[PDB]
Design a protein around this nucleic acid. Sequence first.
DNA 1: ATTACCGGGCTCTGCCATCTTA
DNA 2: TAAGATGGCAGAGCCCGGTAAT
Length: 324
Amino acid sequence: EDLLKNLLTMGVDIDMARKRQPGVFHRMITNEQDLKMFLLSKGASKEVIASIISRYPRAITRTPENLSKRWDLWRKIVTSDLEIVNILERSPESFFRSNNNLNLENNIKFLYSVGLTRKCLCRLLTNAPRTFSNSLDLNKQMVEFLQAAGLSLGHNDPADFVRKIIFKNPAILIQSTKRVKANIEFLRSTFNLNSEELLVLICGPGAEILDLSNDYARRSYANIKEKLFSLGCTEEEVQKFVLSYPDVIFLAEKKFNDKIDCLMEENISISQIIENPRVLDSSISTLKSRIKELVNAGCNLSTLNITLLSWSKKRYEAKLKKLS
DNA sequence: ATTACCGGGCTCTGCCATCTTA
DNA sequence: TAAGATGGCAGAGCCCGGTAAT
């Protein structure tokens, strides 16, 4: 009975919460009060508490003992309470979606047993907290899948391939093996691709490809290929371009296209673009802004070296002064 | 003194489908 | 036999600056 009333004084969006987990509003006992006091005990602001509960109401069904034990386990990894508060604000579900603190502890044991330093577990928890609410078995599957994948290619010690991929791509343990498998095959098929070049790509620049959603990678590449083809780039040129900087796959089709167009409308050649792929890191606003400034100065951007388009504020702004 | 090469930082959440479990 | 627990899915950039090369 007191439930709807407390949620209100707490500042919860009751309508949104009700829609997300209706079953929580049919329980006889709930612990919203204790939770609030618990999170307040740890620095969490009243608004964050309200936002947390709004998004994952089942949070109010946990006891003070479970919460404190779970929190203490996380503090075996993260050094401060404030680091945990921020995590919970970003993702309430990693903390609250399980009550199984034994499983959590076994995850921590298993990850250590995989050879990860405590700083590495910290990186994982901060970047992909969900990793810690996975079942042990699920975290195992991924690690095994990766070992098997590591050696199935030319890798001299798979357990170390695992750690390299995890560092480079913190999100890898919260992807399905199906997804990652597909992304590896996509990479192999689309490009050359001999194992030793596949490894480098995977452990290096092409690491974050691994967590792309099905068919989102294939589709982004297709768009890049089409757009570049329409501009008189050959397939080998396209390939070289993407492999030189696979981050470009991450952009949405329209944004990629728009970004090309915004450059070339100022008479930058497609060649200048694909030979300096980092310019595609800069936002359209930043590109447009700097282009204006440059042309607004003596520059004929047709023959200028455009690498500055992606330099830091400091480095760009300095070169600009000099250009006048 | 300036540019190239290159890695690393920020923060994969929030929803739904399918199982377990009591 | 309803909740809770769990797996898994879609979506999508921008910036900085250390250090090597020139």
